Amino acid sequence: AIRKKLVIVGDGACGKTCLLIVNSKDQFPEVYVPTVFENYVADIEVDGKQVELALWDTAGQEDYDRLRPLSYPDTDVILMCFSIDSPDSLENIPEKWTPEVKHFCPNVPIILVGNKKDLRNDEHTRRELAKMKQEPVKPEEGRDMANRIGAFGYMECSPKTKDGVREVFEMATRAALQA
Ligand SMILES: Nc1nc2c(ncn2[C@@H]2O[C@H](COP(=O)(O)OP(=O)(O)O)[C@@H](O)[C@H]2O)c(=O)[nH]1
Ligand SMILES: [Mg+2]
Incomplete structure (x- = not known):
């Protein structure tokens, strides 16, 4: 089986840990975890061959900036996340996450992920953003950002x-296999 390492990065509260948990498990207890602290793998078949993906979670808050690069050695694919309910998290994609990952993970493919797609049409989300004259991120803004940062793809x-x-x-696995 082919062995590849995936790292997920992005602002706090954008759904990073939940993204790793839902794809790897059938049940998760009633506990909040800042980062997955157990060895989670994703077993994915692509183009008729079995890939095993080690999934590495990170903490996006600034207090962790100094220790976060311990997660980057030998990464094969990056998931770079923002939340569709947070225009501020999208602004941090070119300003913080892109230069950090490009430094520690040179030439590693980036999948830009717009998380919490369900909140784009949520009434409560729309009201909370609207009160500050904001709105959910539009798909065209994510595509534009993927072009700006040179991502391999944009997905919601x-x-x-x-x-x-x-x-x-599946797209992260395809990307990891190119090099
Ligand atoms: N509405 C909605 N909430 C989500 C989604 N994914 C995660 N959340 C919630 O967002 C909060 C933060 O998620 P978490 O995975 O801990 O984010 P992280 O800080 O980036 O690891 C939690 O309350 C989750 O239950 C989603 O797709 N939709
Ligand atoms: Mg987390």
Whole structure:
């Protein structure tokens, strides 16, 4: 079986840990974990061959900036996340996450992931953003950002509803196999 390492990065509260949990497990207890602290793998078949993906979670808050690069050695694919309910998290993609990953993971493919797709049409989300004259991220803004940062692709998903999640890991596997 082919062995590849995936790392997930992005602002806090954007759904990173949930994305890793929903694709790897059938049940998760009632506990909040900042990062997956157990060895989670994704077993994916692509083009008629079996790939095993080690999934490495990170903490996006600034207090962790100094220790986060311990997760980067020998990465084969990056999932770089923002949340569709947070325009601020999208702004941090070119400003923080892109230069950090390009430094520690040179030439490693990046999948830009717009998480929490279910909140784009959520009434409560729309009201909370609207009160500050904001709105959910539009798909065209994510495509534009993937062009700006040189990502391998842009995908949207919801760890909550599961929509789009399998496709994220399949494209990440395809990307990891190119090099
Ligand atoms: N509505 C919605 N909430 C989500 C989704 N994914 C995660 N969440 C919630 O967002 C919060 C943060 O998720 P988490 O995975 O801990 O984010 P992380 O800080 O990036 O690891 C939690 O309350 C999750 O239950 C989603 O697709 N839709
Ligand atoms: Mg987390």
